[PDB]
């Protein structure tokens, strides 16, 4: 291959980046927000998050109201919605992307600030594949992301080439002494990938409080939870999963806030460890990463 | 090219100004086995020779060397 | 760039665009001759503050990937850190037939930002091995107490500017590369000796140039003596206490193979 040198112009912006300069082999997206200060529940009404939401190609099926807990189910997305945060999980045929920008106006347009946000994908092949697409995505999924994050940051979890987490975060969160945004948060995620023998599902046993469950296409389950009671027994929880669906292989994440509710169980049932890590954040939170493959 | 490479080029272009040597290095390390049959002196049985083969290589060349009981030390430049 | 020679490994950094990878297959014929057997490759980097004029292979993670793939297909690649900051891409191999102990040691700093006072003391209009010249360039700048008296050192000053030392004492090495130029300055620090707790070490190295920002990253292999004090709650050197005029921005821990782990650190001045 021939190779001479192209004064070009730097791109003054990192959408002019990735049109210039630049089959989706991931499992599932994620996209987080949390909010300065905790948002009433009612005031951001199903019509506003739907319509965010048909901005990434997605249609409200089903929504429930609970206690602390708004649930939106869409044909290939769940979204949650509390005081405290909103979350969306979705199938990785959803340019999830699509709804950084539009759900942030909408968090404008009520005087809701964002101090936190996240956008999360797990794969199972690598970026550097070029017969796959997974590379031109990530690179819009950075473009809006770092357009409307210029200070957040991506970071990769685990090898590049097997098993492993590529996530966005951005942290503003105020931490002046005199500030009462406090960071006791618990955010557990459990990937298990080629279950044995499609829904989404949430279940609640306390306010703002949930466990959701996503099962669908190779089969895979996707369970989540923040409740307080999970992070006093992780161990005990992951186990009652892969006997439900017996995967071969497993990713688990588990948040230590900066006021810690904690590394990953060194050693799980019937499994081999791939690989360990961990992120740890200048705000003082940690995202500990590990992979799994069945012995 | 891919994501993960656009990524950090935008990192070091937002940390760019035209007014440039890559300071940041390669680094490459190998460590071999030792077989009954291996030579005592391992790699250190080797004459200067033979690693200044290497450098050309890459298109280097040494500059000063300095020797030891355990390391032998190179000093490379463009 | 440096070039270290030992009984049982060789460890090759170079900086600019030296395309490193071009050396390999006479890295693998070094060790046949001998009738040695290759079990363990690492390559590695700092992100490129320019990594649009790296050349060959070196133009993209990708490349890389695919080129040290096409020599070594079960090895693995890894990056630790923000990708559109601070970050080490690392590519690991290794066929460890023998479980072995390993006891070595690695630490590396890459700081940028230099101290503009040192900066007067790394230009010069004519080279200078190593000689009367050099020697006072370390005391003036403080490289005498990095590369105190009891090491055998040879180093290089560069014209118009730049300046290189290797260092080695017994089975210890140490070395020191610095690009002067005000706009993209940048200084690199490596050496493999074993210490319960790096600060002190860093700390001297940060003394000489205290860059505006750095980053740290420490290699633990689960039998060397840093090894047992980190696997026990030990503190190592790198924990932020040791560092009051900076501020840690982001750290990472992997286990990149069984029972060997990897730390790294990026540290940014206050600034008051």
Request: charged content about 20%.
């Given at each position: 291959?021939?190779?001479?040198?192209?004064?070009?112009?730097?791109?003054?912006?990192?959408?002019?980046?990735?049109?210039?300069?630049?089959?989706?082999?991931?499992?599932?997206?994620?996209?987080?927000?949390?909010?300065?200060?905790?948002?009433?529940?009612?005031?951001?009404t199903?019509?506003?998050?739907?319509?965010?939401?048909?901005?990434?190609?997605?249609?409200?099926?089903?929504?429930?109201?609970?206690?602390?807990?708004?649930?939106?189910?869409?044909?290939?997305?769940?979204?949650?919605?509390?005081?405290?945060?909103?979350?969306?999980?979705?199938?990785?045929?959803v340019?999830?992307?699509?709804?950084?920008?539009?759900?942030?106006?909408?968090?404008?347009?009520h005087?809701?600030?964002?101090?936190?946000?996240?956008?999360?994908?797990?794969?199972?092949?690598?970026?550097?594949?070029?017969?796959?697409?997974?590379?031109?995505?990530?690179?819009h999924?950075?473009?809006?992301l770092?357009?409307?994050?210029?200070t957040?940051?991506?970071?990769?979890?685990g090898?590049?080439?097997?098993?492993?987490?590529?996530?966005?975060?951005y942290?503003?969160?105020?931490?002046?002494?005199?500030?009462?945004?406090?960071?006791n948060?618990?955010?557990?995620?459990?990937?298990?990938?080629?279950?044995?023998?499609?829904?989404?599902?949430?279940?609640?046993?306390?306010?703002?409080?949930?466990?959701?469950?996503?099962?669908?296409?190779?089969?895979?389950?996707?369970?989540?939870?923040?409740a307080?009671?999970a992070?006093?027994?992780?161990?005990?929880?992951?186990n009652?999963?892969?006997?439900?669906?017996?995967?071969?292989?497993?990713?688990?994440?588990?948040?230590?806030?900066?006021?810690a509710?904690?590394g990953?169980?060194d050693?799980?049932?019937?499994?081999?460890?791939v690989?360990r890590?961990?992120?740890?954040?200048?705000?003082?939170y940690?995202?500990?990463?590990?992979?799994?493959?069945?012995s | 090219?891919?994501?993960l490479?656009?990524?950090?080029?935008?990192?070091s272009?937002?940390?760019?100004?035209?007014?440039?040597?890559?300071?940041?290095?390669?680094?490459?390390?190998?460590?071999?086995?030792?077989?009954?049959?291996?030579?005592v002196?391992?790699?250190?049985?080797?004459?200067?020779?033979?690693?200044?083969?290497?450098?050309?290589?890459?298109?280097?060349?040494?500059?000063?060397?300095?020797?030891?009981?355990?390391?032998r030390?190179?000093?490379?430049?463009? | 760039?440096?070039?270290?020679?030992?009984?049982?490994?060789?460890?090759?950094?170079?900086?600019?665009?030296?395309?490193?990878?071009?050396?390999?297959?006479?890295?693998?014929?070094?060790?046949?001759?001998?009738?040695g057997?290759?079990?363990?490759?690492?390559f590695?980097?700092?992100?490129?503050?320019?990594?649009?004029?790296?050349?060959?292979?070196?133009?993209?993670?990708?490349?890389?990937?695919?080129?040290?793939?096409?020599?070594?297909?079960?090895?693995?690649?890894?990056?630790?850190?923000?990708?559109?900051?601070?970050?080490?891409?690392l590519?690991?191999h290794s066929?460890?037939?023998?479980?072995?102990?390993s006891?070595?040691?690695?630490?590396?700093?890459t700081?940028?930002?230099?101290?503009?006072?040192?900066?007067?003391?790394?230009?010069?209009?004519?080279?200078?091995?190593?000689?009367?010249?050099?020697?006072?360039?370390?005391?003036?700048?403080?490289?005498?107490?990095?590369?105190?008296?009891?090491?055998?050192?040879?180093?290089?000053?560069?014209?118009?500017?730049?300046?290189?030392?290797?260092?080695?004492?017994?089975?210890?090495?140490?070395?020191?590369?610095?690009?002067?130029?005000?706009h993209?300055?940048?200084?690199?620090?490596?050496?493999?000796?074993?210490?319960?707790?790096?600060?002190?070490?860093?700390?001297?190295?940060?003394?000489?140039?205290?860059?505006?920002?750095?980053?740290?990253?420490?290699?633990?292999?689960?039998?060397?003596?840093?090894?047992?004090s980190?696997?026990?709650?030990?503190?190592?050197?790198?924990?932020p206490?040791?560092?009051?005029?900076?501020?840690?921005?982001?750290?990472?821990?992997?286990?990149?193979?069984?029972?060997?782990?990897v730390?790294?650190?990026?540290?940014?001045?206050?600034?008051?």
């Amino acid at each position: 291959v021939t190779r001479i040198n192209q004064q070009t112009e730097c791109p003054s912006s990192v959408h002019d980046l990735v049109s210039c300069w630049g089959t989706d082999s991931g499992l599932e997206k994620r996209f987080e927000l949390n909010f300065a200060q905790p948002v009433d529940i009612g005031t951001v009404t199903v019509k506003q998050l739907a319509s965010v939401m048909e901005r990434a190609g997605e249609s409200l099926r089903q929504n429930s109201a609970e206690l602390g807990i708004h649930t939106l189910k869409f044909d290939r997305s769940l979204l949650v919605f509390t005081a405290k945060q909103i979350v969306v999980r979705s199938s990785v045929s959803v340019m999830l992307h699509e709804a950084v920008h539009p759900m942030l106006e909408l968090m404008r347009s009520h005087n809701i600030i964002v101090d936190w946000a996240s956008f999360m994908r797990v794969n199972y092949g690598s970026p550097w594949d070029m017969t796959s697409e997974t590379s031109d995505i990530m690179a819009h999924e950075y473009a809006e992301l770092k357009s409307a994050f210029p200070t957040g940051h991506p970071y990769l979890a685990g090898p590049v080439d097997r098993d492993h987490c590529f996530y966005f975060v951005y942290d503003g969160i105020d931490r002046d002494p005199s500030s009462c945004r406090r960071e006791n948060d618990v955010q557990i995620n459990v990937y298990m990938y080629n279950v044995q023998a499609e829904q989404q599902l949430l279940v609640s046993h306390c306010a703002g409080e949930y466990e959701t469950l996503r099962v669908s296409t190779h089969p895979f389950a996707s369970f989540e939870t923040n409740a307080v009671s999970a992070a006093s027994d992780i161990t005990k929880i992951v186990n009652g999963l892969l006997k439900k669906f017996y995967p071969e292989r497993v990713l688990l994440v588990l948040l230590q806030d900066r006021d810690a509710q904690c590394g990953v169980m060194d050693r799980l049932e019937g499994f081999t460890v791939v690989h360990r890590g961990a992120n740890h954040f200048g705000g003082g939170y940690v995202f500990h990463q590990a992979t799994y493959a069945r012995s | 090219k891919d994501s993960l490479s656009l990524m950090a080029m935008w990192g070091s272009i937002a940390r760019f100004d035209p007014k440039s040597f890559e300071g940041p290095e390669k680094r490459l390390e190998v460590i071999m086995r030792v077989v009954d049959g291996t030579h005592v002196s391992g790699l250190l049985a080797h004459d200067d020779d033979v690693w200044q083969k290497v450098i050309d290589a890459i298109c280097a060349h040494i500059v000063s060397r300095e020797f030891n009981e355990y390391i032998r030390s190179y000093v490379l430049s463009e | 760039x440096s070039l270290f020679v030992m009984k049982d490994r060789v460890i090759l950094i170079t900086c600019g665009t030296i395309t490193l990878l071009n050396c390999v297959p006479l890295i693998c014929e070094a060790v046949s001759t001998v009738c040695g057997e290759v079990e363990w490759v690492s390559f590695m980097h700092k992100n490129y503050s320019f990594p649009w004029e790296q050349k060959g292979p070196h133009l993209s993670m990708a490349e890389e990937f695919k080129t040290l793939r096409s020599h070594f297909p079960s090895g693995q690649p890894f990056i630790f850190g923000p990708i559109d900051s601070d970050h080490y891409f690392l590519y690991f191999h290794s066929d460890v037939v023998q479980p072995s102990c390993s006891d070595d040691a690695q630490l590396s700093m890459t700081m940028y930002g230099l101290d503009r006072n040192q900066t007067k003391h790394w230009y010069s209009d004519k080279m200078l091995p190593t000689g009367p010249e050099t020697a006072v360039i370390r005391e003036a700048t403080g490289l005498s107490e990095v590369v105190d008296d009891s090491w055998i050192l040879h180093d290089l000053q560069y014209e118009p500017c730049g300046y290189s030392i290797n260092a080695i004492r017994g089975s210890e090495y140490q070395t020191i590369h610095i690009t002067p130029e005000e706009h993209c300055s940048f200084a690199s620090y490596e050496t493999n000796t074993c210490a319960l707790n790096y600060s002190k070490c860093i700390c001297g190295v940060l003394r000489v140039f205290d860059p505006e920002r750095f980053s740290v990253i420490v290699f633990i292999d689960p039998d060397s003596a840093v090894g047992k004090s980190y696997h026990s709650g030990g503190t190592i050197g790198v924990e932020p206490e040791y560092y009051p005029n900076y501020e840690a921005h982001h750290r990472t821990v992997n286990e990149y193979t069984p029972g060997h782990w990897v730390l790294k650190v990026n540290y940014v001045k206050r600034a008051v």
